[PDB]
Each structure stands twice: as C-alpha cells, then as structure tokens.
Design an enzyme around this catalytic site. Structure first.
Site, PDB file in Angstrom:
ATOM      1  N   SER A 145       6.228  31.333  56.531  1.00 46.81           N
ATOM      2  CA  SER A 145       7.668  31.127  56.364  1.00 46.81           C
ATOM      3  C   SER A 145       7.945  30.354  55.083  1.00 46.81           C
ATOM      4  O   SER A 145       7.537  30.774  54.002  1.00 46.81           O
ATOM      5  CB  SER A 145       8.278  30.385  57.553  1.00 46.81           C
ATOM      6  OG  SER A 145       7.972  31.034  58.763  1.00 46.81           O
ATOM      7  N   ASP A 251      11.735  41.294  58.758  1.00 48.48           N
ATOM      8  CA  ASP A 251      11.500  39.895  59.085  1.00 48.48           C
ATOM      9  C   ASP A 251      12.742  39.267  59.710  1.00 48.48           C
ATOM     10  O   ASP A 251      13.853  39.427  59.202  1.00 48.48           O
ATOM     11  CB  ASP A 251      11.108  39.133  57.828  1.00 48.48           C
ATOM     12  CG  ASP A 251      10.827  37.689  58.115  1.00 48.48           C
ATOM     13  OD1 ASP A 251      11.774  36.885  58.033  1.00 48.48           O
ATOM     14  OD2 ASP A 251       9.675  37.379  58.476  1.00 48.48           O
ATOM     15  N   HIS A 300       8.448  37.402  62.949  1.00 44.88           N
ATOM     16  CA  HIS A 300       8.463  36.339  61.945  1.00 44.88           C
ATOM     17  C   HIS A 300       7.209  35.489  62.091  1.00 44.88           C
ATOM     18  O   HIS A 300       6.954  34.960  63.178  1.00 44.88           O
ATOM     19  CB  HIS A 300       9.723  35.485  62.093  1.00 44.88           C
ATOM     20  CG  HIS A 300       9.826  34.393  61.080  1.00 44.88           C
ATOM     21  ND1 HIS A 300       9.805  34.635  59.722  1.00 44.88           N
ATOM     22  CD2 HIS A 300       9.917  33.051  61.223  1.00 44.88           C
ATOM     23  CE1 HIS A 300       9.896  33.487  59.074  1.00 44.88           C
ATOM     24  NE2 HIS A 300       9.963  32.511  59.962  1.00 44.88           N
TER      25      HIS A 300
HETATM   26  O1  LIG Z   1      12.162  29.856  54.482  1.00 43.55           O
HETATM   27  C1  LIG Z   1      13.117  30.481  54.757  1.00 43.55           C
HETATM   28  C2  LIG Z   1      13.774  30.869  56.084  1.00 43.55           C
HETATM   29  C3  LIG Z   1      14.563  32.233  55.592  1.00 43.55           C
HETATM   30  C4  LIG Z   1      15.061  31.774  54.246  1.00 43.55           C
HETATM   31  C5  LIG Z   1      15.190  32.796  53.130  1.00 43.55           C
HETATM   32  C6  LIG Z   1      14.483  32.154  51.953  1.00 43.55           C
HETATM   33  C7  LIG Z   1      14.489  32.487  50.584  1.00 43.55           C
HETATM   34  C8  LIG Z   1      13.723  31.751  49.684  1.00 43.55           C
HETATM   35  C9  LIG Z   1      12.956  30.671  50.132  1.00 43.55           C
HETATM   36  C10 LIG Z   1      12.940  30.325  51.480  1.00 43.55           C
HETATM   37  C11 LIG Z   1      13.729  31.068  52.398  1.00 43.55           C
HETATM   38  N1  LIG Z   1      14.015  31.129  53.806  1.00 43.55           N
END
Ligand SMILES: O=C1CC[C@@H]2Cc3ccccc3N12
Ligand SMILES: *[C@@H]1O[C@H](CO)[C@@H](O)[C@H](O)[C@H]1NC(C)=O
Length: 358
Positions: A145, A251, A300
C-alpha cells in the site's frame, strides 16, 4: 516472531516525536535481508492528522507498540507459508510517519507533527549494518500500500546510502505491493474541501511533510510538481534499482479514491465501462515493467497475507514469480519461470484464484 528495536537515534521519530523503530528476526548464515514497509494511507494537514492521532495512533506513535510481531506471508520463516525467502533476515518497519515514507521534517515550534518516513528508512538501514546487514548480498526493500509506494520513493536512496557508507556489494532491489496508483479521473468527482483527490492530497502533503522524491524523478517534474513521483508509472522509469511491481488490476484503494463504492447492487453500464477501463489502464502502465504480478482481482495488498501463495497468474504464483526474478538477477528469459505476469481478462475475479474475501 520479530522483536522490536526502537531507533538508537532518537531524533528520528514517529509523528508525535516518539522514536521510530523496526522489528527484526535474524537468520544467521543468511546474506538475504528483507526490509518491509508497512502501509496505511497518510494524513496531510493538521485537522486530518489530529483525527488520525485519535483513532489510528499506532500509525503515528510508537508509545503503544508491542514488543514482538508475528511474521506473516513473505515475512514468515516457515517454508510452508513463505516458499520465496523463508530463511532471510526479516525486518518489519512500522509506518508511523503518515507521509507515504517521504517525509524529512522534525516536530518543532512550527510543526505539530514530525514527518520523517524517508529518514526512518535510512536510520533503520544504518543501524542494521551493525547487526549483520554489513554482510548482506541482497537487500530487498518491500512494502504494501503506502509502503509499496514508499519502496518506489526510497529504493534508490537506500542503494545510494549503502554505496556512500562503503557497501557497494549489497544488491538493493525493490518489491512494491499495491502501491502502483493511477492519477485517473474519478468515477464521481468531488472538488477538494477535505473530497480531496490523491493528486491534490499528495501535493499538499509534500509541502506539509517536507516530502522528498527520487532525484531523477524530481529533476524531470521539477519544483512544485513532485507529487507526480508518488505515482508508480511516472517514478518507476526513473529508478535504477530492480523493482518487482505487484498490483491488483482492480485495487480497492484505487477504487476508493476513485469514489467507486461497490455495493453488491447491480453494476450499470457507466460503472462497468469505468471498471473495465481502469483494469485496461493499469495493464497498460505495466506493459514495459518486466518484473510484475498483476491479477484481475478486486482486493488490496498481497505480500504479508498468510495465504499470499494462493493467487496465480497464468498458473504461476507470486512466490514462484519472485523466485524466477531472483534467478533472472543472477550474474534472457527462463524456461517456465516467468517474471512478467499480468492478467488480460477484463473483470474482477475473472481469474479463479482471486482472494475470496472470506
Ligand atoms: O496509499 C494510498 C491509499 C490509496 C491512495 C492513492 C495514492 C496515490 C499515491 C500515493 C499513495 C496513495 N494511496
Ligand atoms: C540522527 O539522525 C539525524 C537525521 O538523519 C542525523 O542528522 C544525525 O546525524 C543522526 N545522529 C547520529 C548520532 O547519528
């Protein structure tokens, strides 16, 4: 079981100024080191960081951390659960900086919170060198994540750090799980009061965190546009370290930030086309990623799940694909040992091995 070590350099802190740290399980006579970055979203201003501190405090503070954690999935030491790297030295780095592992800012007169994710990784690496990492042959920086995005942001800096510290023989590689996001159009569109799409949320985050991005990506996008380097398909081609990309085609966190809330209700044409186009765009961004694993599932994270061995693309599991990746990096493709595994079918769970969600 991995044992907690709080950082000896207490200037390197979680959000609230408590020391950051890492959980370690050594494997003597292994020269493989797995450093895993935890995920868990982020916060990007005083109000939403305060809210996170109330009800997600372990992601902002070490005050309540347990002294041990159980290694699971790729962090498991049993071959049965972890066919890939069960005998490696295992490190779990708790995510307590809420900055997608990019921050380089201390708590101070001007900052209610510290955002030190990039410095946390560097300090863990530095303190591990005296616990056997000095003898490593491979350091795999993995993460899920936000931690998977953290791999992309930090893998080349760990490589540069070890080179400047005098360890050019350690091969640094990255394993980015579920951190490969698209700055696509939302299915339904909010402006940005809180509603804040990731591009705007990250843009404000970088200023709030004093976020740092890989140097070659920073030089492409330049001042004010660093938020671009948090998106895998833009930062990946600037990286030098080998990086294996794991991403579900559908996702759940991507769908969440796209304001897609799947309800069990029937899917209308507009949403069907949206979901199919998301899978197609994800697949497209992975076409020139030689080491990747991208099943057509609505899910996820994968790699620290205990049943991470169950999912297959074209009949090849993720532990096998990672093993094939290992072989490909030995000092031409391998017969029956593929590393590029991207599903082509166009709907969640068209792959029968998808997680059941049970
Ligand atoms: O970690 C996470 C959870 C979902 C969001 C979308 C995103 C874009 C760039 C960097 C991090 C994150 N997200
Ligand atoms: C502690 O970490 C900070 C931030 O990286 C660094 O500037 C400082 O030199 C470190 N202190 C020691 C004693 O290593």
């Amino acid at each position: 079981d991995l044992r907690l070590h709080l950082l000896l350099n207490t200037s390197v802190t979680c959000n609230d100024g408590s020391p950051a740290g890492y959980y370690l399980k050594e494997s003597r006579g292994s020269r493989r080191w797995l450093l895993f970055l935890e995920g868990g979203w982020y916060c990007f201003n005083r109000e939403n960081c305060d809210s996170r501190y109330d009800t997600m405090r372990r992601l902002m503070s070490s005050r309540d951390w347990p002294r041990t954690r159980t290694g699971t999935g790729i962090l498991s030491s049993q071959p049965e659960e972890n066919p890939y790297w069960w005998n490696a030295n295992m490190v779990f780095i708790p995510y307590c900086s809420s900055d997608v592992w990019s921050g380089a800012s201390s708590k101070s007169e001007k900052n209610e919170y510290a955002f030190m994710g990039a410095l946390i990784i560097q300090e863990v690496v530095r303190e591990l060198l005296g616990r056997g990492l000095s003898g490593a042959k491979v350091l795999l920086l993995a993460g899920s994540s936000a931690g998977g995005t953290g791999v992309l942001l930090n893998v080349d800096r760990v490589a540069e750090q070890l080179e400047k510290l005098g360890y050019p023989a350690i091969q640094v590689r990255g394993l980015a799980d579920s951190g490969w996001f698209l700055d696509n159009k939302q299915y339904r569109h909010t402006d940005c009061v809180d509603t804040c799409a990731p591009t705007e949320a990250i843009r404000r985050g970088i200023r709030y965190w004093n976020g740092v991005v890989p140097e070659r990506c920073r030089r492409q996008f330049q001042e004010g546009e660093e938020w671009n380097c948090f998106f895998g398909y833009k930062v990946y081609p600037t990286l030098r370290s080998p990086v294996f990309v794991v991403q579900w085609l559908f996702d759940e966190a991507q769908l969440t930030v796209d304001n897609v809330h799947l309800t069990g209700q029937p899917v209308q044409e507009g949403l069907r086309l949206y979901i199919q186009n998301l899978g197609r765009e994800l697949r497209h961004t992975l076409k020139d990623v030689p080491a990747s694993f991208a099943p057509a599932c609505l899910s996820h994270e994968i790699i620290i799940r205990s049943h991470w061995t169950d999912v297959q693309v074209k009949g090849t599991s993720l532990p096998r694909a990672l093993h094939c990746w290992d072989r490909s990096l030995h000092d031409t493709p391998l017969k029956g040992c593929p590393v590029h595994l991207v599903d082509s079918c166009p709907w969640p769970h068209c792959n029968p091995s998808c997680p059941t969600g049970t």
